[PDB]
Amino acid sequence: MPIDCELSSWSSWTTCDPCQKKRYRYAYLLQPSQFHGEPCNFSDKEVEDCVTNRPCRSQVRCEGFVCAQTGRCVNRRLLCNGDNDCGDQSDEANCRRIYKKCQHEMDQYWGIGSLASGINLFTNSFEGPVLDHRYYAGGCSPHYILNTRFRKPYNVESYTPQTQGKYEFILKEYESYSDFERNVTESGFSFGFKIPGIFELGISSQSDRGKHYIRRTKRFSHTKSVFLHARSDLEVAHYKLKPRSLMLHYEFLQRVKRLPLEYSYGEYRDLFRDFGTHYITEAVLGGIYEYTLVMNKEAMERGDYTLNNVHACAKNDSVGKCRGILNEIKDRNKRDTMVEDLVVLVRGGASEHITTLAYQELPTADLMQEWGDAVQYNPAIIKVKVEPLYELVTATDFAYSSTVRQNMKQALEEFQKEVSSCHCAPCQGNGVPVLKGSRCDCICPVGSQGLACEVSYRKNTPIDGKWNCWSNWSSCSGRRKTRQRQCNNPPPQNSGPASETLDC
Amino acid sequence: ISTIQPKANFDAQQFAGTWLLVAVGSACRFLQEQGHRAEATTLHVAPQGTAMAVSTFRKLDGICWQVRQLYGDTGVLGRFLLQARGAVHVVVAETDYQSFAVLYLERAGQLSVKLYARSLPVSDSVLSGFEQRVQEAHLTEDQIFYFPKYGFCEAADQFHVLDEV
Amino acid sequence: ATPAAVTCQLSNWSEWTDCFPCQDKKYRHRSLLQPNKFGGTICSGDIWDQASCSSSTTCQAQCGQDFQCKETGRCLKRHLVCNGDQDCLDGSDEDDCEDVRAIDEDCSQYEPIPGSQKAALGYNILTQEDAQSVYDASYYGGQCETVYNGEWRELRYDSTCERLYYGDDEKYFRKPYNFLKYHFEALADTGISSEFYDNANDLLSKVKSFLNELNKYNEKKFIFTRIFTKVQTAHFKMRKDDIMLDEGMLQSLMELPDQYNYGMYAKFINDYGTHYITSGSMGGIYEYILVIDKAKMESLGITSRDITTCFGGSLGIQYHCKKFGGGKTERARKAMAVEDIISRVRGGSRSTITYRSWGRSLKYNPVVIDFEMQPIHEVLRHTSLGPLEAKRQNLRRALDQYLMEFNACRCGPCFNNGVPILEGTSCRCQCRLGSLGAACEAKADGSWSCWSSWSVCRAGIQERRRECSCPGRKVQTQ
């Protein structure tokens, strides 16, 4: 049975905002389309063209040359330098000669663009560019890494190379599958959606090929299974963004200039959808490589094998002979017996260590050197220090910064709820719902077919309880929100708080 | 996509061994610009099933390399599939197996004609025959590119071999 | 209970529009009053009409201080005049330009993001087809934004071009003005599923017209399996304001009268889609059906699972053969009990291709696998040409007419959980062979009747109902 997408009715129009010369209204999603229901292929907002007068204070003029399309305020010292500073069209039109368009061919830092794009921390996806990492400040910071002539962007404070480490795999044992969500439960926001200190970017969340990780590991929930986890880490570069006066991306600049001062969720929502909710002030670039062995306890305890056996046997593939079938009952996981699955997950350098090799075929040889090169040329953001988007909205770029900042703060609150997968109706068979926009799709555990994942080879699977969305706060008699575990409660099975309260 | 006739009873065993690349008929980006840059190119062919193991030996940056490809079975005796963006369709069009061979290759809908030989001098009537064949393959006399006649790689060297296989 | 067949009903031709100088053309249309349902006789004529015309008086020039192309009315900012880039399709922005030096940004050396053209096409939801371009996939308008390719390093040879090299030419892909963001997904262990089906119809069920190329094998001597996977190689987001439209669309859009005319606007919709894409994912599908001789299977001592298993290794995938090998001929196919294989492959540069192979090329030639979208008319608010309010209300008006006129619910009832299909002006039914009537004659049906007409106002409010268990709302309010 389909569920059709449904949005609320239109919010009361806003009164004309002076600068935009416009009014806005929006709708909000009450029900996501699901199970091939009818989707929401129309806009969740409108804008009307207006007429008032109320005074509007523009920006402090512009000293330098104004860009024709992007409306950036480049310094005249940047006209005809062979750079696209108007980033982009032309500080570079109508130039008789070019000055200092170098005798030195330059690469950009590899993957640098990614670090300039904003990030949805609620969903972990990368979005539109917020930072212009292709903007040199007229400067030319040449940087040499592993025999390549690189060019540092004005924004970047630092991008230091890291001395190549070791394929040292860490190895973590686990008994219950439950105990195994310490590897896969990867947020924790402090006031103003701030987060001090580096954290593993669990990119794979509602993300996208964490969706084959979830298919593969969730089938081991009726946990007769025991889990060994292998993980190695390659840091290749540390990155640090300038503390301030940053060069915003021109696309981001223009959209922010477009936002109203009257608070209107619809416009601020769009902003977060295109640009995310945070950006990157610090990062470890590199690569992971993780694989996990899933073992049937019983069949393991009938070859007379122990976790120690495997744990310690994994330091190569307690100094006795493991490498029996403890290596072949592994090699022949896919005809013979005992090893339930070997699940691999590689972040950074994902070229051809994937196909024919790393992923489900062999575990891992000394093709870690090979993967080591590839990371070097395609590193991933592994660790990150973040900042809310509103910290980019400053007075020197923006009229009314103060208001726009406050407006973004409140909307970030509304947004967090609106993008959460708790609005999604339950799948069955223990599957995972994921919200994207207004549609909602089920991630099914291997062994489950159909939307809602209700077709399966196993009966009365323990269904794990899941939450519906937090209720609205009862505002300021002293605030508390409630939550029910109704959104799939356990039919024969089994977290977080049901109630939560904020000082008001 | 475009289709013409393979060697009657094409015989991989007879076609085996070393061939010298003599000329390419084509219009790729490369062959117009870095044209002056063609390396001497030697093809080593050996039968394997209805497929054909093909080694190409040539210099990169003045080191001899060896590329190992697999000219896999199309299900048609004489046609071969090979595979980066594109799909390589090889056709053995014409060959005595003792002196010359004409190959076609289609990628992303586009033809190229290759001429190979067991030794140089190639014959001129053979060059003509291949010229005549390109000017009906719908490429121009300026779109023929004659490769070097010396500089052929002996053997590639275990560290320096591409293994597309 | 054979329903009484129905004759096709078309309205009268509307009165001809006035003539149109910039092509000397008259237009008229008529409406699908009633399609022919059961053995109703066709209605021969078409629903659009036109006529050479020559009462033309004059023949959009609107481009204030901006540059304008010859006979596209695309407005260009004057700095894209002679900049080493075709920003008009006339080329008239790079024209007459003798002594003019031009910066490179070492950028036009690169290809566009893979899929750009597919992503700029409109989309028609009634037919699920692609319309013509809505965005200009190839307008850069002075931008030089690029998307980095991790794989650009791999050493590669290239037999056609006799080129051996690492691939500096696909280190970056150029991102056109109309794209806010475009990110590559690392190819992950994308799991290939495997299902086995008793008979053609049980296999149709999962899906719901290779259904046609399959009603050759419903003979219960045929079992079936399928190989399915979906892959994402990129996520992308289209720009929301200052959208540059495909010049072709720009033409059509200008050639629209401000006085409502259904036929004009329907023709437009027809050409450019009911919707356009605001964003999505790039990638593809590697899909195969195996058609199997049942008795021949059993005779070799073998199962469907076994045949799927050998088939998978001739592709290189994971979840007698004394002639199978690759499964490269009818003879070899047959041999191992395989009657036919059907390629559902979408994306990648019909026959059979390996997985390692298809997966190395998909990044470079993907389809739009997933996508958000919005009605065609919502793009008018979002363009550089600025306001176009008459044009847009007109286009909204016609879209709601068009999306009712041609909806397949108008195709009677189709019993047997049978699918009703509207084609041209005739309704048919694709209820697979198990009932036989024109509407197909134990498990029950359910299916919504068409939305009725807007019931005229009770206090500025209209209602609209329907009936048949059918799911969703049976009533709405406008």
Ligand SMILES: *[C@@H]1O[C@H](CO)[C@@H](O)[C@H](O)[C@@H]1O
């Ligand atoms: C959108 O707005 C229209 C016009 O006011 C109404 O049908 C209703 O308010 C809806 O939410």
Ligand SMILES: *[C@@H]1O[C@H](CO)[C@@H](O)[C@H](O)[C@@H]1O
């Ligand atoms: C749009 O604006 C109108 C006129 O100001 C309102 O009356 C309406 O309800 C909506 O807010």
Ligand SMILES: *[C@@H]1O[C@H](CO)[C@@H](O)[C@H](O)[C@@H]1O
């Ligand atoms: C609790 O509420 C927060 C945001 O309001 C989200 O984490 C999620 O909506 C959950 O219901």
Ligand SMILES: *[C@@H]1O[C@H](CO)[C@@H](O)[C@H](O)[C@@H]1O
């Ligand atoms: C509880 O949360 C809702 C949702 O944004 C707001 O009304 C307000 O933040 C309140 O404290």
Ligand SMILES: *[C@@H]1O[C@H](CO)[C@@H](O)[C@H](O)[C@@H]1O
């Ligand atoms: C088309 O136009 C002609 C003349 O008006 C007739 O066949 C009929 O009106 C139809 O609508």
Ligand SMILES: *[C@@H]1O[C@H](CO)[C@@H](O)[C@H](O)[C@@H]1O
């Ligand atoms: C109810 O109508 C919906 C969408 O209009 C479909 O699920 C189905 O056609 C049913 O009759």
Ligand SMILES: *[C@@H]1O[C@H](CO)[C@@H](O)[C@H](O)[C@@H]1O
């Ligand atoms: C409901 O109305 C909509 C739009 O007119 C269509 O989906 C269909 O005609 C149905 O009856």
Ligand SMILES: *[C@@H]1O[C@H](CO)[C@@H](O)[C@H](O)[C@@H]1O
């Ligand atoms: C609803 O009214 C709309 C336009 O206002 C039409 O699409 C249709 O005639 C229906 O009665």
Ligand SMILES: [Ca+2]
């Ligand atoms: Ca400049």
Ligand SMILES: [Ca+2]
């Ligand atoms: Ca130009």
